[PDB]
Amino acid sequence: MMQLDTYDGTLELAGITLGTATTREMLIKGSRLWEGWPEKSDGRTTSYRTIISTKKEKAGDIYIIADFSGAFITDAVLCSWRFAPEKLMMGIQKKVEGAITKNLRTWFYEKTHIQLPVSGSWGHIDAAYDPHNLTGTIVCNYRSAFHTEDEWRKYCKRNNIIY
C-alpha cells in the first residue's frame, strides 16, 4: 500500500498519489471526503484534509493534510503535505527530537523500508513535531513551498540537504 519514491518525492498510499506535479484536480477526487482545512468561505481554500479508515493499519486512521500553491485553479500544484496514523500523531514532546518523531520514523521504516529523512532537489521529507498543536507528522516540503531561492538554500543548509 505505502511507498515513497526517494528520487522525486512522490508518496503513494491508499490509492492517493502526492507528488510535485499533483494538482488540485488530480488529488481532490473520488468517494473520498476531502475537506477544507481550513475552509475559507470566499472559496480560496488551499489546504485539505482526508482521513483514511483502513481496516488493516495497526496504528489507526491516517490523517493527511495537503497544501496547494493557489486558490480555485484546477492546476494549482501541491507544495507540501503531511500525514500520521492516529496512534502516533498526538502527544507531548519537549524537544525537536523525541519519542513522537522517533516512533513515526520507526513506523514509516516498518511500512516502506525507507529511513527518514529523505531529500533532494525536489524537497524534503521527515518526521517533525508541531509544538503548537502537540502533534507529530511525516512532513513533506516540496521546492514549490519556498517562494525564494535563498529561503530554499538556507533551509537546505539548516536541514542537511545535499544534491
Binding site: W37, P38, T46, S47, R49, Y63, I65, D67, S69, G70, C79, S80, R82, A84, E86, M89, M90, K94, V96, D126, A128, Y129, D130, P131, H132, N133, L134, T135, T137, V139, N141, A145, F146, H147, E151, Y155, R158, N159
Partner: protein, 132 residues
C-alpha cells in the same frame, strides 16, 4: 525561570511545518502579568490581550494572526484560557510573521514562548469561547 526562551521559540522554526523563522527576543514577564492560550492542549505558546482583542471573537482571525495551523484532528481551538504569571520569568517573544501567508494567515500577532509554562503560569477564570 532563567532560561533562553527566545532560543527555544526559535528552535521550533526553520524545519517541518513552521519553516519560517521569526525574530525572537527575551523579555522579563512580571508577576501578575496575564497571557492567553488556546484550550484544550496547553503548550509553551501564548499571546497577549492586544492580539486576542484584534481577532474580534473570530478563531480564524486569531490563529491566522499567530500563524498557527488548525490541529490535524481537532481543527482550530475554539476556547481561550487566560493565565497569570506566578513569578518574574523570562519569555521569548516577537511577531508571528515569517510563515507563508496563503497557508498560515497574514500573521502580525504577538507570541510568547515559555518552556516552564506548567510551573510558572496559573490558569485564571473560566475558559471562554470564541466564534468562527
Amino acid at each position: 525561570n532563567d532560561h533562553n526562551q527566545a532560543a527555544f521559540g526559535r528552535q521550533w522554526q526553520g524545519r517541518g511545518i513552521y519553516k519560517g523563522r521569526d525574530s525572537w527576543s527575551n523579555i522579563m514577564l512580571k508577576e501578575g502579568d496575564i497571557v492567553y492560550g488556546g484550550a484544550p492542549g496547553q503548550s509553551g505558546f501564548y499571546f497577549n490581550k492586544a492580539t486576542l482583542d484584534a481577532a474580534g471573537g473570530s478563531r480564524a482571525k486569531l490563529w491566522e494572526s499567530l500563524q498557527v495551523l488548525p490541529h490535524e484532528k481537532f481543527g482550530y481551538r475554539s476556547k481561550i484560557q487566560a493565565y497569570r504569571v506566578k513569578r518574574e520569568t523570562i519569555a521569548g517573544t516577537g511577531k508571528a510573521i515569517s510563515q507563508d501567508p496563503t497557508r498560515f494567515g497574514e500573521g502580525g500577532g504577538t507570541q510568547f514562548f515559555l518552556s516552564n509554562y506548567k510551573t510558572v503560569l496559573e490558569p485564571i477564570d473560566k475558559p471562554f469561547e470564541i466564534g468562527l
